[PDB]
Write a protein that binds this DNA or RNA. Structure first.
Lengths: 470, 470, 470
RNA sequence: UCUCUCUCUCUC
RNA sequence: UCUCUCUCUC
């Protein structure tokens, strides 16, 4: 059933919106100041710093960074008669802990935490990607496309684990491998056992993320190494560059600004009654009647800022620019010529130059965002019946495909990673930049609610550039 | 997290400083005597000898060099009413081993030991470059800029592996290749196993140090030779010659003399609380308020000696003279016209001519020392995405940059080294000596603590000479 | 490390000394008979006839030369109450081989074979220059200074190949290419395959011994010729004419008379304990208290013979007469006015004519025979830093000397040998006969052991002639 | 080398 | 070939 999930997510976002309402009440902010992204951003880093129970425990025993008992940051932006001023107001964690506890009807609301931290990961991926760490581990900077959910720490649950990219897991596992290579950390002690456990948890997350059997089997065999040394490093680099084309089925969770939920809840649009969804039309129509104000530099233009905000909201920074333009209806400028900077404001920037203005989030069309892969993999390896089920009692042979059943069970088990790298190479050669994917699905219009009739897009606009970076 | 590494480095430097305080207590030296470079050098080389297990174990089975059961060296210099005296005082290994034992709260302090070996590597690289071994191996002494950490023994760990450079690894590999050519050391004995293990580990370190893909793949094809003969000899020479321009980001650890650390520790500046960094402003901020004395010959210029010792402390002997002078604030004299000699003093030179004086270490500016390479390599090979991820479920093509996809995989595996020499010489031809590097970075002022605003240098002083040697 | 090398050196020279002692044992010779250079010469020639496995294997299948089953030569001289007698005593190979086996504790002592062959090469080069070979090859007899180690056979190892001079290598290359011109030996048979491996190895030695890179390139381009004809003949000729001034650092190994080692070992001076070297003070310190007797014709000058024996022992046949006179302390007579003959005695000369007399070997000073070249080549082509190592991350250009790095790679590969001949000619024009050498090295006094202080010689005796030949 | 291998972010 | 052309080095 899907009604229960819809009711749960509706209750969750209703609690989130009511917490936004109460923060607006408590902060004594104006109507316009309650529609600013910066305030929600700072408040949500406060949120994560209050539920980072692991870091709370680590910092209680580590009283450093000067005045840091329980309070961090808090750069609240306020308006005086047109001009803007930032105040470093410090809030302790504990009162906000109870205000959450009262905001979710006595519950902890950790799922909402996962969605906000994922949405921060989405905005981080949209704004800046780290080739710095990517080459710190030595991996080439060609794979910036697989840094989805990179900023997400381990503390998130399964829902958070679903949206993290393959490359994020590759980076996280290489960090552990390099740490275990630097020092003899895999001893029979509890630390070794726990890092072992986290390792297989991250690995079965990985093998769940993939779709084709060959990469799942080679991930299975990578596990067989009890002592991760140097060979596994290139083994999993080969895994990553294979996932470049044999991409993993990674979800795209549609989270929206802290305010958008608050404005919707304040108007009385209860999500429990009519139901809510995270993949369907819902986050699209809530943005159809949402007003958002933002802060812009004297050199920054708002036109690219609105598009970057739409990137951050819908996590489409790693998608084709042409498709995003089609749903937008306007051309989406790649990051090469974006005359803008990061959304977050540096702590040293002056305030006389800063100017606030609206953001455009209206889109002409809407589309479903499933956690599936391109149809090209199914074209390379088709599907269908593998055996037959006897129905009538008639003397006959029972057909069964031996060369497929034996290959599924791998009667002669693979010896190392290179033998499967051979099929990786032949699949890559079979792959083409022409194979059309997502057959049977299309882009839909706003006026339709039940997914009745789509329109098939068709682009012949040469080589405008389907690459957000470079 | 960076707090844990900061605490660890602060702890081990505090241990080193309080060991130096213990040495100053036990040696019964005056206040000026503990501000001498020479006595710190003597005690520090003594520590190197005491903690070097391999040479020791080679020595108790080899009772040679006359008086050598367990005591070596020890030329302690003492000021006698203005004059100086040198005494050859001999110390046991176990006593000072245990003095370290409580000098670090029961730990081995391997990281501190690596710090001392690295600081020795910097002093040797600043004073004398080993053209002699280069010509011995037939290797051109034009490339002394590849001799980072040549005096380092192989006992240094991963932290020590970070600092030892590409050309030094070429030299040590050439040594082992010459040894294996002289005699058949490649048999199936345990010696052959340890040789191949060391050889593959050192090749892994090499492939870690390089940046461009072509050199990495050529090195990966280097160790395919199970029986290294003569071809890999010129292969490695050409590796060094190509790494001349495509340099590897090895390391430039800013190690400081034990006297400076001891003076800071004695004053009560505990490093654990406020933190320590070896790469940022921190190793710099101790030096503008540091007093250092040293002995000088009646012909040596103290002004040159201060510049040379600041070079050795900051390991800037292979850095360009223009920027080194800009950061220092005064012109730096190249090795050609230095009216000074090595900071180490000969054991046979007379006692009368030595004169002590203060060493100038204060510098006008500061800069961060990143372990990276010039931007010119990224100019030759640009940056950007290679793959895309489907965010919306739309029936569309998945753009893949196929010709670079083969390039990463090398579908047609390289036949030999020569095909790689071809395009690497092509890249060398594409290189220009006017390529500005390190974009987006600059030199900051001492009043800056958080790296808020740098100033970009601009050198138009003709051809003063960006070559410390020659 | 050098301790193991000195220990091994002491080991095999101690074995050789004990072998000579036991020769004195079962030869039933007197004390004076054990101090005769020619007895050592004859015994050691019988030894080489015993240890020439290739020559033996060529010999048993060819039973010629009358009484030659296993016994060759053996002209032993004995004193009969003042007079002299010569007897042709024949010994087998196997018992001598077994005595060597028992003399080096069951080892083959191939290093001793190499050293004895090197001593023979120095003796023959000092005595007679085979200008007949030069005229047969057509190479002019003014190049006899490049005849170092001509008598050496191919069977010598890497140490034996080290002393072999450039001219001798050119000679066997001319011989082999002439043989390849006479008949079609370059066919696909195994003989041609061993031919090409030998030719390539000799070319590797050729590129090894020189110092300047342009000749490396020229000799490498000589080697690529799959069919060496008359052009490569001329190429090697020009290589010799270039190597006259661009001398290769071949070797100057100082091997000495077996009688001297036997006398030293018999006295109880163990070389393994105190260490021994073939380049340092050791060969100098043993000869100051060594007595050697030799046979002299009724016309031969004993004063000339002592000097010739000392020069042959120290391998100064191609050195400077003036420097030899300085190191010896007395004037060295050139070959033009030597009133002596070859050390070895002809088999037909009568026994009544020659008389025994002492040989003077003591020298006033001692020096070091380094395996390097004159400083003039480094004056023509200097040394220094060519590339810059970025230490501090600063927005700057990273200089690299393009006109030198490109010249190192030779981006436009050399067309033929003539283009390199052109730069050889211009370097010859830049060459001068007044280029001083030993800038920092000098001749030392005997009383010093640890290489403390030199005296720089100054020769102003006009034009006595620094030419041992002519 | 998590005190910055490039597109810049106080955010660990 | 560790006792060392090269700018010093126990």
């Amino acid at each position: 059933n899907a009604t229960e999930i819809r009711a749960s997510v509706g209750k969750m976002i209703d609690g989130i919106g009511r917490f936004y309402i109460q923060m607006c009440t408590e902060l004594k902010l104006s109507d316009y100041e309650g529609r600013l992204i910066q305030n929600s951003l700072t408040i949500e880093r406060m949120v994560l710093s209050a539920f980072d129970e692991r870091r709370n425990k680590y910092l209680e025993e580590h009283p450093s960074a000067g005045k840091d008992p329980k309070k961090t940051g808090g750069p609240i932006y306020r308006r005086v008669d047109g001009k803007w001023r930032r105040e470093l107001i410090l809030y302790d964690k504990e009162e906000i802990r109870r205000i959450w506890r009262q905001a979710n009807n006595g519950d902890d609301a950790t799922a909402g935490l996962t969605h906000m931290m994922i949405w921060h990961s989405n905005l981080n991926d949209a704004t800046y990607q780290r080739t710095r760490a990517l080459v710190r581990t030595g991996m080439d900077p060609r794979m910036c496309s697989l840094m989805q959910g990179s900023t997400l720490p381990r503390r998130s649950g399964a829902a958070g684990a679903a949206v993290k990219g393959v490359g994020t897991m590759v980076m996280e596992l290489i960090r552990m491998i390099k740490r275990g290579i630097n020092d003899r950390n895999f001893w029979r002690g509890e630390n070794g056992r726990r890092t072992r456990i986290a390792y297989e948890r991250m690995c079965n997350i990985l093998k769940g993320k993939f779709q084709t059997a060959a990469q799942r089997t080679m991930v299975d065999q990578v596990r067989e190494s009890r002592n991760p040394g140097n060979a596994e490093f290139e083994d999993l680099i080969f895994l990553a560059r294979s996932a470049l084309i044999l991409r993993g089925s990674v979800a795209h969770k549609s989270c929206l600004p802290a305010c958008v939920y608050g404005s919707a809840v304040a108007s009385g649009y209860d999500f429990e009654r009519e139901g809510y969804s995270l993949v369907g039309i819902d986050p699209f129509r809530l943005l159809q009647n949402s007003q958002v104000y933002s802060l812009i530099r004297p050199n920054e233009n708002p036109a690219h800022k609105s598009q970057l905000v739409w990137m951050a909201c819908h996590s489409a920074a790693f998608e084709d620019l042409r498709v995003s333009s089609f749903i937008r209806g306007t051309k989406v400028v790649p990051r090469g010529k974006l005359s803008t900077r990061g959304v977050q404001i540096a702590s040293n920037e002056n305030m006389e130059t800063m100017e606030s203005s609206t953001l455009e989030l209206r889109s002409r069309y809407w589309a479903i965002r499933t956690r599936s892969g391109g149809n090209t993999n199914q074209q390379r390896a088709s599907s269908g019946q593998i055996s037959i089920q006897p129905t009538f009692s008639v003397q006959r042979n029972l057909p069964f495909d031996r060369p497929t059943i034996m290959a599924a069970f791998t009667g002669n088990t693979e010896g190392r990673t290179s033998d499967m790298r051979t099929e990786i190479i032949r699949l890559m050669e079979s792959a083409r930049p022409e194979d059309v994917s997502f057959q049977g699905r299309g882009v839909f219009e706003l006026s339709d609610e039940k997914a009745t009739s789509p329109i098939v897009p068709s682009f012949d606009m040469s080589n405008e550039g389907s690459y957000f970076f470079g």
